[PDB]
């Protein structure tokens, strides 16, 4: 019995007649590149992506970010080509490149990177950590406004937070310094949330900082709706992630419903949901920047639960499922002597009635 | 080698001439069957013997009612040469609680709910 294929065969297009006059791969790299291209296309037969690939919805994720900047491509290309010609005009650059001694300044490259494609890389990077999945239930946005947040450690050093870098709670015991480019007369709203810091509701999140109606770049003048609270990841609970949300306001907004007492050391009031918060403020508020970091447990976390939160610090542990053993049989034929130990509870001798 | 038979799906596709020949209606398929075994399971493969036991068709010439569903029909497509399949007719509708003791199945497939044993006055 035979069944016709449900679609085109893989190598159906190849002509078997003129096999001698067909160009060959001749190399492993050429076949490898072509092989990967066909592996990324859907097929009517069962594939590895069907069972192990991450399922996605056909509806494309909606964008809630700022409108993209308007740039004249024709003018941009003329200046870009001219600059390269002058760079190649120098006889020293060619010799340095030919002698394999040339190098580029790291600081200058990142300066242009953050302006052209930095926001685009951050959106892809934030998607990997599931920030869009948790905060906005899949909604994405491009961070058109770069956000520079750094925690003050001592008096001379700073701990920059770019995207998910490891930061200890000791460095984050005090409110960081927030700097971002903005025009005068604009209104902003900062927000810091702990997605994984919650101890009771997996879905809910903990509020650690909430500044509203920030005039321009002057963060201090912004209203303190909720006082800053350092992250408190429990010991043995893994690695948590805290995200800085930078909102842009078009008109002044009233946050009386979201107001919290100062200080706010109750976790019930610290409970916060980004999805519901942005849902009722999406009309006149739109996210513009994004920053986040990863935080572990240290000794400073113990001070937060005892003194600040006035509670006992919880300790978690990574528990693995018990090993699988088949149902015990009366006659374990050909099994080794250690068969009976796998089904024994205690290692100490027993005597029954004796 | 003698093995099981795979019936093509084209066999169970009624033509327009068949609907006016047996009195069926493709738009309103019947709900229940009336299967009656008319052939012996002896000298037949063992798998056909089992299906007769599954359907409760042990004794021949004994009507049994089954549901017109693909899973039940799947078993009937294997022992179709041993049974007679007839749709169940309900001129008075489904039997009620007061009609359980007065039902009667006729050879035409109709299940009457008033079996009076009296000649028609008409």
């Amino acid at each position: 019995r035979r069944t016709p294929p449900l679609g085109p065969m893989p190598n159906s297009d190849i002509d078997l007649s003129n096999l001698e006059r067909l160009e060959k791969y001749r190399s492993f790299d050429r076949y490898r590149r072509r092989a990967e291209q066909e592996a990324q296309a859907p097929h009517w037969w069962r594939t590895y992506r069907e069972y192990f690939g991450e399922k996605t919805d056909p509806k494309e994720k909606i964008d809630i970010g700022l409108p993209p900047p308007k740039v004249s491509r024709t003018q941009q290309l003329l200046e870009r080509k001219q600059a390269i010609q002058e760079l190649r005009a120098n006889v020293e650059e060619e010799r340095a490149a030919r002698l394999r001694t040339a190098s580029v300044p790291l600081d200058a490259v990142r300066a242009e990177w953050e302006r052209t494609c930095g926001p685009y890389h951050k959106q892809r990077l934030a998607e990997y950590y599931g920030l869009y999945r948790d905060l906005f239930h899949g909604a994405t946005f491009v961070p058109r406004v770069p956000l520079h947040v750094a925690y003050a450690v001592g008096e001379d050093d700073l701990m920059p937070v770019y995207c998910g870098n490891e930061v200890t709670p000791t460095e984050a015991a005090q409110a960081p310094e927030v700097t971002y480019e903005a025009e005068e007369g604009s209104l902003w709203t900062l927000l810091l949330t702990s997605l994984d810091g919650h101890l009771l509701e997996p879905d809910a999140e903990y509020l650690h900082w909430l500044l509203t109606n920030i005039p321009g770049n002057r963060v201090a003048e912004g209203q303190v709706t909720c006082p800053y609270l350092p992250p408190f990841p429990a010991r043995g609970s893994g690695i948590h992630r805290l995200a800085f949300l930078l909102f842009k306001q078009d008109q002044p907004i009233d946050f009386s419903e979201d107001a919290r007492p100062s200080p706010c050391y109750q976790l019930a009031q610290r409970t916060f949901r980004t999805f519901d918060f942005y849902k009722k403020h999406q009309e006149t508020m739109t996210p513009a920047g994004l920053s986040f970091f990863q935080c572990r447990w240290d000794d400073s976390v113990t001070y937060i639960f005892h003194q600040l939160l006035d509670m006992r610090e919880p300790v978690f542990e990574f528990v693995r499922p018990p090993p699988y053993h088949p149902k015990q049989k009366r006659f374990p034929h050909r099994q080794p002597l250690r068969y009976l130990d796998r089904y024994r509870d205690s290692h100490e001798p027993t005597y029954g009635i004796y | 080698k003698f093995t099981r038979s795979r019936i093509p799906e084209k066999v169970f596709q009624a033509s327009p001439e068949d609907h006016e020949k047996y009195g069926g209606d493709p738009q309103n398929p019947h709900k229940l069957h009336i299967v009656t075994r008319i052939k012996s399971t002896r000298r037949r493969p063992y798998w056909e013997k089992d299906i007769i036991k599954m359907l409760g068709l042990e004794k021949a010439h004994t009507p049994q009612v089954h549901k017109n569903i693909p899973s039940v029909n799947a078993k009937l497509k294997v022992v179709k040469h041993l049974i007679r399949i007839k749709p169940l007719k309900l001129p008075q509708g489904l039997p009620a609680e007061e009609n359980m003791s007065n039902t009667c199945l006729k050879s035409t497939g109709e299940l009457v709910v008033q079996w009076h044993l009296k000649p028609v006055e008409q």
Partner: protein
């Protein structure tokens, strides 16, 4: 031969019964009989069979 098959007045044919396993007839038939349709028995060919 094709005309004979088309205008045949018998509603029952070897091909129809064999493929549909009517009356359990495949118990006494052959796997090749589903394709021969009764036109070939052993090494002999019967042109009169439709």
């Amino acid at each position: 031969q094709e005309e004979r098959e088309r205008n045949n007045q018998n509603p029952w044919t070897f091909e129809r019964i064999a493929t549909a396993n009517m009356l359990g007839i495949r118990k006494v038939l052959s796997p090749y009989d589903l394709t021969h349709k009764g036109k070939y028995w052993g090494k002999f060919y019967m042109p009169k069979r439709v």
